[PDB]
């Protein structure tokens, strides 16, 4: 299947003071593999999967040096944004930054990402063509213009289509048994009598990997977000994921309803019905 | 691996 590598950076001011919090994490697909936490004692990039543990000292020193450069960059940025929006010093604010690359089944580049949020809303994002920027407002337009005069986008596109993609392939192979496994969901169906002429039908998917999955309910019949509640896909904590979808049904008619499960672990989709 | 060049907003 397709694979991806992503990096997530969170920077939070804490004025009073003092120092802002900087947290960076790294993922290949749905498996975390590195971290940096400004508040930990080490002050180093640190491993979070068994297969990244084989990298040499120069990798770890390399990553640490670079993540510290990132961190001081977002230190300035927090100051700057405080100015672009005229906000005082007493308030706590947040920058989030995400970047990475998608490959398809052939492991050649497919897509690249490079975007920022301020206080939980989009700020500026490199577009899918890796050539132009979406600046969501007037402060973000100062950034866009600054980045255009200095040909920032061209250097990012070279990274994302090149180096980003070579690191992902290396990683996919370091951790072949981890990262390249698929885990078909274990499925079942509960039926709770909630009300007297009404019933809950609940479709479960357990122990699956990757996280991506589609759970739909049909009556007869066809799709219905006409009284289907979902939950966010959640980590089991062993490296697998869980999900459920529910419908409320008029009691005596469970028979009309079928749950439909799509994964990559499934050769073809599952259809489940309720069993007496 | 992460980016070896940094730039301010």
């Amino acid at each position: 299947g397709s694979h991806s590598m992503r990096y997530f950076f969170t920077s939070v001011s804490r004025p009073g003071r003092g120092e802002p919090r900087f947290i960076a994490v790294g993922y290949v697909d749905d498996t975390q593999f590195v971290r940096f936490d400004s508040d930990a004692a080490s002050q180093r990039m640190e491993p979070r999967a068994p297969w990244i543990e084989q990298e040499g000292p120069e990798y770890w020193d390399g990553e640490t040096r670079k993540v510290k450069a990132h961190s001081q960059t977002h230190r300035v940025d927090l100051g700057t944004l405080r100015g672009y929006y005229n906000q005082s010093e007493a308030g706590s604010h947040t920058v989030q930054r995400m970047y990475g690359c998608d490959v398809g089944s052939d492991w050649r580049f497919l897509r690249g990402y490079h975007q920022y949020a301020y206080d939980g809303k989009d700020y500026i994002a490199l577009k899918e063509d890796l050539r132009s920027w979406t600046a969501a407002d007037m402060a973000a337009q100062t950034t866009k213009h600054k980045w255009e005069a200095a040909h920032v986008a061209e250097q990012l596109r070279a990274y994302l289509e090149g180096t980003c993609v070579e690191w992902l392939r290396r990683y996919l192979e370091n951790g072949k048994e981890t990262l390249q496994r698929t885990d078909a969901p274990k499925t079942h169906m509960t039926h709770h009598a909630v009300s007297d002429h009404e019933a809950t039908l609940r479709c479960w998917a357990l122990s699956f990997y990757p996280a991506e999955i589609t759970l739909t309910w049909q009556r007869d019949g066809e799709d219905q977000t006409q009284d289907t509640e979902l939950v966010e896909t959640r980590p089991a904590g062993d490296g697998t994921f869980q999900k459920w979808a529910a419908v409320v049904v008029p009691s005596g008619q469970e028979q009309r309803y079928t749950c439909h499960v799509q994964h990559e672990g499934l050769p073809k989709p599952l259809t489940l019905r309720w069993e007496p | 691996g992460i980016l070896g060049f940094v730039f301010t907003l």
Partner: T-cell receptor
Amino acid sequence: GITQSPKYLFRKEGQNVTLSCEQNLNHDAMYWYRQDPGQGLRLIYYSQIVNDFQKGDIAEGYSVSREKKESFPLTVTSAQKNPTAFYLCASSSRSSYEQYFGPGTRLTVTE
Amino acid sequence: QLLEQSPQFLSIQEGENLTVYCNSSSVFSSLQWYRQEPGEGPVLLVTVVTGGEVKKLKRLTFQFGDARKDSSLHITAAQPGDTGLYLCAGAGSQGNLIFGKGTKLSVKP
């Protein structure tokens, strides 16, 4: 512009000396090179952003600090034994982009 | 990353035309040309960005290769005043410029 003072410097071996490099161009990123006669530039130290620096190709026996956006001082210590050179500072609006050089300092170290 | 400049020295006669090369095995997202006189800072002549693009100053013409892996500097009817060392440089992935070792040009009357 970028400035560095002085044009000519002269020291006795065993002395440390700090070369001054200032700019009001509003640049984030600063650089130091040495150049030997009839040669190209060799990178000693750079700084992509205030409060951060990193080593060049030819860093042993040199140090730097970057406490203020505007200034990138370079200290020549009892380093190796080839401190005599033309030293040139440059900056750029962001690291990796076009650089503007200063007029240079000629440092001779006598026995 | 490597940028290779050639030739190291070129001696020619006033009124003659000339090209010089800066070659790489990898793409460079932006590239620069400088001219240095001795005991002076390099003067920045041009930046180029788009593969294939051409730029001019006085008697100089610069070109970025299509695949963004090389650049040329051309002088048309060179004069004694074009004498100088000429350097190329490109965006480095570690937050620096990568420099070629230079070309030393003499134009003689």
